[PDB]
Amino acid sequence: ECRVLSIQSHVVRGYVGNRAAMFPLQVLGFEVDAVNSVQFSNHTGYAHWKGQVLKSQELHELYEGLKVNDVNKYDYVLTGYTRDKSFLAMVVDIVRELKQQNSRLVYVCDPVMGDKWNGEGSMYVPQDLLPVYRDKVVPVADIITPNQFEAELLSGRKIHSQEEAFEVMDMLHCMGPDTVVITSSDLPSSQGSDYLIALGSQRMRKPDGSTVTQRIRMEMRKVEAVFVGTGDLFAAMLLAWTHKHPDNLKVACEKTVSAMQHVLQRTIRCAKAEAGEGQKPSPAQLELRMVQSKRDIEDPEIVVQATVL
Amino acid sequence: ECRVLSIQSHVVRGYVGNRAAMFPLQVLGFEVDAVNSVQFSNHTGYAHWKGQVLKSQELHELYEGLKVNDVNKYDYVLTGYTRDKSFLAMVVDIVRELKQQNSRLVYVCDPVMGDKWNGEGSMYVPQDLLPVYRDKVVPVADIITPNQFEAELLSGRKIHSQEEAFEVMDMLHCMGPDTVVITSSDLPSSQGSDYLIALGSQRMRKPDGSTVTQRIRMEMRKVEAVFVGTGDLFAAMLLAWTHKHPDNLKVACEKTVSAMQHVLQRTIRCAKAEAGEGQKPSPAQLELRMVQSKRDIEDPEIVVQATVL
Numbered sequence: 264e265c266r267v268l269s270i271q272s273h274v275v276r277g278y279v280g281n282r283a284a285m286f287p288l289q290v291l292g293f294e295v296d297a298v299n300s301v302q303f304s305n306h307t308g309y310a311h312w313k314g315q316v317l318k319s320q321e322l323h324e325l326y327e328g329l330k331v332n333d334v335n336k337y338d339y340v341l342t343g344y345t346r347d348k349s350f351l352a353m354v355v356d357i358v359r360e361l362k363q364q365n366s367r368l369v370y371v372c373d374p375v376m377g378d379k380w381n382g383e384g385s386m387y388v389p390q391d392l393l394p395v396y397r398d399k400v401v402p403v404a405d406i407i408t409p410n411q412f413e414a415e416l417l418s419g420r421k422i423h424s425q426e427e428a429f430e431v432m433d434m435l436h437c438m439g440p441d442t443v444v445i446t447s448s449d450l451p452s453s454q455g456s457d458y459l460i461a462l463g464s465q466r467m468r469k470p471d472g473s474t475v476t477q478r479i480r481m482e483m484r485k486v487e488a489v490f491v492g493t494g495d496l497f498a499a500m501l502l503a504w505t506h507k508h509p510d511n512l513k514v515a516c517e518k519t520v521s522a523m524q525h526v527l528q529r530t531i532r533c534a535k536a537e538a539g540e541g542q543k544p545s546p547a548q549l550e551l552r553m554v555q556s557k558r559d560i561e562d563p564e565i566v567v568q569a570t571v572l
Numbered sequence: 573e574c575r576v577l578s579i580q581s582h583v584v585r586g587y588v589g590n591r592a593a594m595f596p597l598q599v600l601g602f603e604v605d606a607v608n609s610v611q612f613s614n615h616t617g618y619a620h621w622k623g624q625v626l627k628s629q630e631l632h633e634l635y636e637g638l639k640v641n642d643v644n645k646y647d648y649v650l651t652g653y654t655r656d657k658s659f660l661a662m663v664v665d666i667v668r669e670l671k672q673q674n675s676r677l678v679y680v681c682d683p684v685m686g687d688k689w690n691g692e693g694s695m696y697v698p699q700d701l702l703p704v705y706r707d708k709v710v711p712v713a714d715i716i717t718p719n720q721f722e723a724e725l726l727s728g729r730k731i732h733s734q735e736e737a738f739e740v741m742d743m744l745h746c747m748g749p750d751t752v753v754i755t756s757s758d759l760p761s762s763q764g765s766d767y768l769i770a771l772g773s774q775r776m777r778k779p780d781g782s783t784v785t786q787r788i789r790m791e792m793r794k795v796e797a798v799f800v801g802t803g804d805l806f807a808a809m810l811l812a813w814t815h816k817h818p819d820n821l822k823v824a825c826e827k828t829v830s831a832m833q834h835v836l837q838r839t840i841r842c843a844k845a846e847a848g849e850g851q852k853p854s855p856a857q858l859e860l861r862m863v864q865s866k867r868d869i870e871d872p873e874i875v876v877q878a879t880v881l
């Protein structure tokens with residue numbers, strides 16, 4: 264039995280945050296203790312949204328409720344989108360305490376700050392969080408899944424080539440996490456502009472005390488839509504598949520990405536079905552077809568192959 | 573697809589309310605929009621607990637967030653334990669509006685108000701809701717899953733025999749819902765004192781335009797432990813199987829009760845395993861093994877047979 268503490272947002276409708284994380288982890292065999300950092304009607308990509316946000320003090324109370332009953336015992340910790348610096352500090356405190364309690368605990372972190380629109384890079388999170396993630400969160404993480412912009416923000420270096428990207432990933436390894444995946448990047452692909460490039464790096468221990476970094480690269484088809492909650496889903500499935508494949512980042516990333524691709528392909532198909540023929544689907548019609556993809560999440564058909572560098 | 577609006581509690585750890593309803597319904601192929609009426613660390617059976625309660629105003633805003641985006645379209649509505657009169661009135665208003673929008677909507681309601689400890693009957697809910705449930709909720713409900721004590725409260729008449737139980741169920745049919753299932757009772761079983769009796773009743777329209785009431789009985793073995801969330805799970809799975817078998821309450825209840833049986837058998841097994849040999853398992857060790865029972869929930873092996881009266 265593998266228990267994951269997932270502290271993420273909750274939407275009444277749709278799949279972002281914990282809604283995008285609990286179902287896949289449960290279908291993949293993980294107990295999930297879920298702290299819903301917000302309760303919104305839907306994700307903010309909609310025209311409107313209503314709801315409430317959990318205060319950090321409220322998050323602390325929940326964790327203390329678990330601690331008092333001696334149930335604050337976890338094998339993993341999963342976090343994602345946060346706009347409250349204090350809440351991030353609370354999460355870091357909790358992770359440190361759980362790691363004192365269990366040295367084998369794995370903290371998977373999606374450090375969400377921004378993304379590259381067109382060629383420009385833009386942050387959708389308060390700026391005062393960049394120090395935190397860099398100085399307090401990522402140092403305590405074991406798996407991080409940033410995108411190129413976030414990788415650049417964390418390392419302070421811009422990425423212009425794949426070799427520069429892996430130098431940045433080595434810097435991130437040095438900051439803390441032994442597994443680093445750059446989920447998206449503006450690096451060119453060998454198949455064309457319709458494919459996106461993602462890279463992975465896992466540093467592993469040797470018998471002599473030394474350490475070897477395994478590097479992998481993946482090219483994925485781009486689906487022509489903007490989806491929300493994809494990162495959150497990606498980090499959950501990466502957690503699961505790295506757990507089953509702790510020494511093979513290649514296989515874990517292959518399974519994860521294939522499952523993402525399956526989910527997105529089904530989602531874009533059903534979205535264009537709901538919308539008129541040749542019509543732009545709305546955020547509501549682009550909600551991930553999570554339920555309808557259960558089997559794909561359980562045992563994905565491999566549709567991408569990672570190259571070991 | 574089939575979308576369910578489920579307004580129930582949420583626990584960080586464990587399976588009650590939405591935690592006990594979302595996963596099975598999603599695994600059974602239903603889109604689920606979930607409104608967490610509360611967020612607690614764990615259910616109140618533990619030694620300690622902390623969390624927050626959603627206000628009715630907050631519930632209204634979530635529903636309005638869905639409405640403004642033209643996303644308040646549902647095939648089912650599912651509710652359970654509530655302690656606030658205003659919250660129940662809000663739920664009733666929402667159900668009324670959704671039924672105005674769609675006459676085919678089915679409201680599944682577990683009218684949770686109390687249960688029978690030993691032979692005595694005791695209430696878990698403020699008294700001012702019993703009028704509400706009787707006068708405002710049940711009238712707009714289509715499926716209800718009360719226990720003997722709740723059925724007695726709603727009907728105002730005590731149940732001493734199975735014939736009296738079906739008279740009470742006919743009264744409840746008269747109050748609104750065309751399907752009524754009494755999930756637990758103190759009626760004797762021909763197989764022993766370790767069997768629990770559940771009864772069902774569905775009013776169905778015939779081809780001639782008239783209506784026939786189908787009644788069924790189920791004898792199920794007691795598992796000697798106290799579980800939490802079982803009503804929530806029961807109602808969710810009953811919703812699913814009645815959707816699959818709209819004219820066969822027999823099969824729907826057989827599947828539902830079999831899944832419950834599988835889940836509870838696995839749960840008591842693993843709970844006694846976690847606890848010492850010959851040790852009473854704790855509330856924490858008796859949390860439903862929801863994830864590990866996925867497959868049984870997907871397609872339960874029939875282990876009980878309902879007799880058609």
Ligand SMILES: Nc1ncnc2c1ncn2[C@@H]1O[C@H](COP(=O)(O)OP(=O)(O)OP(O)(O)=S)[C@@H](O)[C@H]1O
Binds near residue numbers: 377378409485494
């Ligand atoms: N339109 C898309 N086409 C193909 N893959 C996508 C698409 N959107 C998301 N993905 C997949 O989802 C992963 C994460 O994407 P996103 O998270 O949406 O983008 P991102 O830039 O990583 O944003 P983050 O990591 O959450 S802040 C990517 O690495 C892809 O695997």
Ligand SMILES: Nc1ncnc2c1ncn2[C@@H]1O[C@H](COP(=O)(O)OP(=O)(O)OP(O)(O)=S)[C@@H](O)[C@H]1O
Binds near residue numbers: 718792797801
């Ligand atoms: N100890 C048990 N032994 C066998 N079956 C059980 C047990 N507890 C729960 N169940 C199953 O789950 C259902 C339990 O429903 P209950 O939780 O008893 O409903 P209730 O507690 O009587 O009141 P409500 O309003 O439904 S929450 C039963 O119909 C059984 O299917």
